[PDB]
């Protein structure tokens with residue numbers, strides 16, 4: 038039945054996927070997230086991928102390229118869509134498991150739609166947070182309630198750090214990110230239990246649809262690279278999250294105190310080319326006989342294989358810009374997504390058929406490695 042439509046792949050699951058944005062409150066300390074969810078309507082595939090010019094300006098700043106690159110990126114990618122139905126109604130059905138997703142350094146909430154849409158197509162609600170810790174290439178917020186209804190945006194761009202700042206600011210940021218993940222969860226749970234919430238963005242989607250929609254027993258946190266460190270910090274702080282999946286986690290931000298505080302299952306899915314010994318050693322600090330830990334490495338992949346820019350360009354250009362690895366981008370994301378589904382079934386107790394991919398958790402595939410290729414004897 039399935040066939041190619043958008044550059045970013047459609048979900049492999051049985052459900053069509055809707056998408057909307059939620060900001061509450063309006064401030065630099067409020068929650069900002071992009072929601073993906075099972076929808077009934079299948080037509081539209083009309084969610085704009087990068088919805089504001091300032092994100093392209095932010096990406097240029099993050100890349101350290103000349104100011105005009107922002108304009109060029111906007112020209113190239115400003116009309117790009119992702120295969121989700123903008124503001125489509127939530128599919129009625131059984132309570133849905135929930136994932137809170139954390140983006141990497143230089144990213145923002147909309148850049149992991151291949152992951153969000155795949156999860157939603159298999160029956161998850163996914164809340165992709167936008168962080169206000171100055172790790173996003175760009176984000177926005179407002180000065181007051183009137184500026185929200187008026188729409189005078191204040192933009193906040195990635196903070197570049199001096200070496201002496203790395204050694205404390207990254208930790209401050211990961212703690213803020215964990216707070217933001219827990220706060221996003223609380224916001225979604227408030228909406229689930231019927232607390233009125235006023236979206237600071239004016240959008241068609243009525244949040245009251247989400248009343249009684251969440252399976253409060255089946256909540257996980259997933260994140261890429263800074264987001265992988267965020268997974269670990271969040272699990273250590275918030276037991277409402279029952280398991281975590283870290284995608285090419287970047288471990289540098291984390292303090293030593295976190296490891297002993299994570300009873301929950303944790304899955305590391307790594308790229309072949311990003312990882313390095315100092316990082317792997319910190320992953321190993323998470324291992325203990327009393328804790329469930331799994332690790333796989335995707336053969337021929339780079340850290341950008343987890344993010345949507347891996348689909349944005351052709352093979353040759355993508356490889357040159359290190360947006361693509363040697364492996365095909367759909368092969369890689371399918372492995373990550375299927376292994377994730379199996380892990381989530383196992384540790385959230387889902388009554389689905391994702392256990393068909395149990396072997397992927399063990400790295401048993403021609404394009405996977407159990408554990409790591411990195412040596413640190």
Ligand SMILES: *[P@](=O)(OCC)N(C)C
Pocket residue numbers: 140141142143144261262263264287340344
């Ligand atoms: P990570 O947060 O991945 C970039 C999206 N990192 C390499 C710091």
